Design a protein around this motif. Structure first.
Motif, PDB file in Angstrom:
ATOM      1  N   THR A   2      26.964 -21.759  20.578  1.00 39.15           N
ATOM      2  CA  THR A   2      27.522 -20.517  20.052  1.00 39.15           C
ATOM      3  C   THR A   2      29.038 -20.659  20.036  1.00 39.15           C
ATOM      4  O   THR A   2      29.632 -21.025  21.054  1.00 39.15           O
ATOM      5  N   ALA A   3      29.674 -20.378  18.899  1.00 40.33           N
ATOM      6  CA  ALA A   3      31.100 -20.661  18.758  1.00 40.33           C
ATOM      7  C   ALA A   3      31.930 -19.988  19.846  1.00 40.33           C
ATOM      8  O   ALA A   3      32.874 -20.586  20.393  1.00 40.33           O
ATOM      9  N   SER A   4      31.572 -18.751  20.191  1.00 48.81           N
ATOM     10  CA  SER A   4      32.422 -17.928  21.044  1.00 48.81           C
ATOM     11  C   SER A   4      32.644 -18.574  22.404  1.00 48.81           C
ATOM     12  O   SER A   4      33.771 -18.617  22.902  1.00 48.81           O
ATOM     13  N   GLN A   5      31.581 -19.085  23.020  1.00 45.68           N
ATOM     14  CA  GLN A   5      31.701 -19.575  24.388  1.00 45.68           C
ATOM     15  C   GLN A   5      32.587 -20.812  24.464  1.00 45.68           C
ATOM     16  O   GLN A   5      33.436 -20.927  25.359  1.00 45.68           O
ATOM     17  N   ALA A   6      32.394 -21.757  23.544  1.00 42.45           N
ATOM     18  CA  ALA A   6      33.211 -22.964  23.556  1.00 42.45           C
ATOM     19  C   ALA A   6      34.673 -22.631  23.306  1.00 42.45           C
ATOM     20  O   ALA A   6      35.570 -23.120  24.016  1.00 42.45           O
ATOM     21  N   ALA A   7      34.934 -21.804  22.290  1.00 41.73           N
ATOM     22  CA  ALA A   7      36.310 -21.394  22.050  1.00 41.73           C
ATOM     23  C   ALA A   7      36.892 -20.704  23.276  1.00 41.73           C
ATOM     24  O   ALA A   7      38.066 -20.898  23.607  1.00 41.73           O
ATOM     25  N   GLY A   8      36.073 -19.930  23.992  1.00 41.41           N
ATOM     26  CA  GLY A   8      36.575 -19.213  25.153  1.00 41.41           C
ATOM     27  C   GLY A   8      36.941 -20.128  26.304  1.00 41.41           C
ATOM     28  O   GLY A   8      37.957 -19.926  26.974  1.00 41.41           O
ATOM     29  N   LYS A   9      36.124 -21.147  26.556  1.00 35.52           N
ATOM     30  CA  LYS A   9      36.462 -22.090  27.619  1.00 35.52           C
ATOM     31  C   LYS A   9      37.730 -22.862  27.273  1.00 35.52           C
ATOM     32  O   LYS A   9      38.658 -22.978  28.092  1.00 35.52           O
ATOM     33  N   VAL A  10      37.807 -23.377  26.046  1.00 38.06           N
ATOM     34  CA  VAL A  10      38.999 -24.142  25.702  1.00 38.06           C
ATOM     35  C   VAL A  10      40.230 -23.237  25.651  1.00 38.06           C
ATOM     36  O   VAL A  10      41.361 -23.710  25.813  1.00 38.06           O
ATOM     37  N   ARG A  11      40.039 -21.925  25.457  1.00 38.70           N
ATOM     38  CA  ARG A  11      41.134 -20.981  25.659  1.00 38.70           C
ATOM     39  C   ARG A  11      41.499 -20.873  27.129  1.00 38.70           C
ATOM     40  O   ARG A  11      42.680 -20.800  27.477  1.00 38.70           O
ATOM     41  N   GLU A  12      40.500 -20.838  28.007  1.00 37.22           N
ATOM     42  CA  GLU A  12      40.793 -20.892  29.432  1.00 37.22           C
ATOM     43  C   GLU A  12      41.599 -22.132  29.779  1.00 37.22           C
ATOM     44  O   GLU A  12      42.212 -22.186  30.849  1.00 37.22           O
ATOM     45  N   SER A  13      41.613 -23.127  28.894  1.00 38.89           N
ATOM     46  CA  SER A  13      42.566 -24.227  29.003  1.00 38.89           C
ATOM     47  C   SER A  13      43.854 -24.010  28.209  1.00 38.89           C
ATOM     48  O   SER A  13      44.632 -24.954  28.059  1.00 38.89           O
ATOM     49  N   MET A  14      44.099 -22.805  27.698  1.00 32.93           N
ATOM     50  CA  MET A  14      45.365 -22.515  27.030  1.00 32.93           C
ATOM     51  C   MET A  14      46.384 -22.199  28.120  1.00 32.93           C
ATOM     52  O   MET A  14      46.152 -22.554  29.279  1.00 32.93           O
ATOM     53  N   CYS A  15      47.515 -21.583  27.772  1.00 35.91           N
ATOM     54  CA  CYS A  15      48.598 -21.334  28.720  1.00 35.91           C
ATOM     55  C   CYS A  15      48.071 -20.846  30.062  1.00 35.91           C
ATOM     56  O   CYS A  15      47.346 -19.850  30.136  1.00 35.91           O
ATOM     57  N   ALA A  16      48.410 -21.577  31.119  1.00 38.87           N
ATOM     58  CA  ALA A  16      47.997 -21.192  32.461  1.00 38.87           C
ATOM     59  C   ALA A  16      49.091 -21.429  33.496  1.00 38.87           C
ATOM     60  O   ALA A  16      48.852 -21.198  34.687  1.00 38.87           O
ATOM     61  N   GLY A  17      50.275 -21.874  33.090  1.00 46.39           N
ATOM     62  CA  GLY A  17      51.326 -21.999  34.093  1.00 46.39           C
ATOM     63  C   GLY A  17      52.091 -23.305  34.003  1.00 46.39           C
ATOM     64  O   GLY A  17      51.530 -24.399  34.048  1.00 46.39           O
ATOM     65  N   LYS A  18      53.413 -23.174  33.882  1.00 45.96           N
ATOM     66  CA  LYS A  18      54.322 -24.317  33.885  1.00 45.96           C
ATOM     67  C   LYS A  18      54.693 -24.618  35.333  1.00 45.96           C
ATOM     68  O   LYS A  18      55.820 -24.399  35.786  1.00 45.96           O
ATOM     69  N   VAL A  19      53.714 -25.126  36.070  1.00 42.15           N
ATOM     70  CA  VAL A  19      53.878 -25.491  37.475  1.00 42.15           C
ATOM     71  C   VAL A  19      53.828 -27.012  37.535  1.00 42.15           C
ATOM     72  O   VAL A  19      52.755 -27.616  37.570  1.00 42.15           O
ATOM     73  N   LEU A  20      54.994 -27.647  37.545  1.00 42.64           N
ATOM     74  CA  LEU A  20      55.098 -29.096  37.620  1.00 42.64           C
ATOM     75  C   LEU A  20      56.059 -29.469  38.734  1.00 42.64           C
ATOM     76  O   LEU A  20      57.011 -28.735  39.014  1.00 42.64           O
ATOM     77  N   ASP A  21      55.810 -30.608  39.370  1.00 39.37           N
ATOM     78  CA  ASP A  21      56.654 -31.068  40.469  1.00 39.37           C
ATOM     79  C   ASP A  21      57.516 -32.218  39.968  1.00 39.37           C
ATOM     80  O   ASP A  21      57.063 -33.362  39.881  1.00 39.37           O
ATOM     81  N   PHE A  22      58.766 -31.902  39.646  1.00 40.35           N
ATOM     82  CA  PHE A  22      59.698 -32.897  39.128  1.00 40.35           C
ATOM     83  C   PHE A  22      59.785 -34.157  39.974  1.00 40.35           C
ATOM     84  O   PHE A  22      59.842 -35.249  39.388  1.00 40.35           O
ATOM     85  N   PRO A  23      59.815 -34.103  41.309  1.00 41.78           N
ATOM     86  CA  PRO A  23      59.802 -35.365  42.060  1.00 41.78           C
ATOM     87  C   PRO A  23      58.572 -36.207  41.782  1.00 41.78           C
ATOM     88  O   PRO A  23      58.688 -37.428  41.614  1.00 41.78           O
ATOM     89  N   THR A  24      57.394 -35.590  41.701  1.00 45.98           N
ATOM     90  CA  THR A  24      56.186 -36.373  41.477  1.00 45.98           C
ATOM     91  C   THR A  24      56.178 -36.989  40.086  1.00 45.98           C
ATOM     92  O   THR A  24      55.854 -38.173  39.924  1.00 45.98           O
TER      93      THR A  24
END
Lengths: 59, 35
Positions: free
Chosen positions: A15-37
């Motif tokens: 069903t189109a909706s569920q797949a699109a929804g999960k890959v949306r759950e992979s859309m913007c979620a936070g610019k949390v990066l560790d520059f030293p790493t």
């Protein structure tokens, strides 16, 4: 063996909706990066590349 | 000798500079450590 046969029930219907929804759950979620790493792994990408090119180039 | 005295007095302004620069280095590492 029991695993490899335990997959035996037909590929489910989609069903189109569920797949699109999960890959949306992979859309913007936070610019949390560790520059030293990221910088450390950058340095190691550098050393891998340099060591390799010196290896095969043999100069 | 008086002029050499003036030079000597400033030569330790250099020692403070050395300290400040060392402090700046520790800070810059702090910036890199903290993203």
């Amino acid at each position: 063996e029991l695993l490899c046969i335990m997959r035996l029930w037909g590929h489910p219907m989609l069903t189109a909706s569920q797949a699109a929804g999960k890959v949306r759950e992979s859309m913007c979620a936070g610019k949390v990066l560790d520059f030293p790493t990221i910088m450390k792994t950058l340095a190691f990408f550098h050393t891998i590349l340099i060591n390799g090119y010196r290896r095969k180039h043999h100069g | 000798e008086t002029k050499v005295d003036r030079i000597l007095s400033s030569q330790s302004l250099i020692q403070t500079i050395k300290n400040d620069i060392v402090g700046l280095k520790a800070g810059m590492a702090t910036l890199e450590g903290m993203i």
